């Protein structure tokens, strides 16, 4: 089974503060189109909160499922969010 966590972040003065890779046409692992968190930016909301980690797979932002999307669409979904943002992640499985 998947180890799933839900994290609600307030963007704040420095924003959510994490980078993502992966996506359709931009695979992080061969055969895997998942979106992966690759950096936690110093000073951002993700760092302050502490729950998100490099290596997490970003499953959804609010009501938008990101399990099989283009990287550009995943980035857009993160930017199309208001001050409180629901993030659902899978922790490393393997």
Curated annotation (Swiss-Prot):
Signal peptide: none annotated. Belongs to the MAGUK family. Interacts through its PDZ domains with NETO1, GRIN2B and SYNGAP1. Interacts through its guanylate kinase-like domain with DLGAP1, DLGAP2, DLGAP3 and DLGAP4. Interacts with FLTP/C1orf192. Interacts through its PDZ domains with APC. Interacts through its first two PDZ domains with ERBB4. Interacts through its third PDZ domain with NLGN1, and probably with NLGN2 and NLGN3. Interacts with FRMPD4 (via C-terminus). Interacts with LRFN1, LRFN2 and LRFN4. Interacts with DGKI (via PDZ-binding motif). Required for learning most likely through its role in synaptic plasticity following NMDA receptor signaling. It comes from Homo sapiens. The chain holds residues 223 to 314 of 817 of the full protein. It is linked to Intellectual developmental disorder, X-linked 90: A disorder characterized by significantly below average general intellectual functioning associated with impairments in adaptive behavior and manifested during the developmental period. Intellectual deficiency is the only primary symptom of non-syndromic X-linked intellectual disability, while syndromic forms presents with associated physical, neurological and/or psychiatric manifestations. This is Disks large homolog 3. Residues 6-91 form the PDZ domain. The gene is DLG3.
């Amino acid at each position: 089974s998947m180890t799933i966590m839900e994290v609600n972040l307030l963007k704040g003065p420095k924003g959510l503060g994490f980078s993502i890779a992966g996506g359709i046409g931009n695979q992080h692992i061969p055969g895997d189109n998942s979106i992966y968190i690759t950096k936690i930016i110093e000073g951002g909301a993700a760092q302050k909160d502490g729950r998100l980690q490099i290596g997490d797979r970003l499953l959804a932002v609010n009501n938008t499922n990101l399990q099989d999307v283009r990287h550009e669409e995943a980035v857009a979904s993160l930017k199309n969010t208001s001050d409180m943002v629901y993030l659902k992640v899978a922790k490393p499985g393997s």
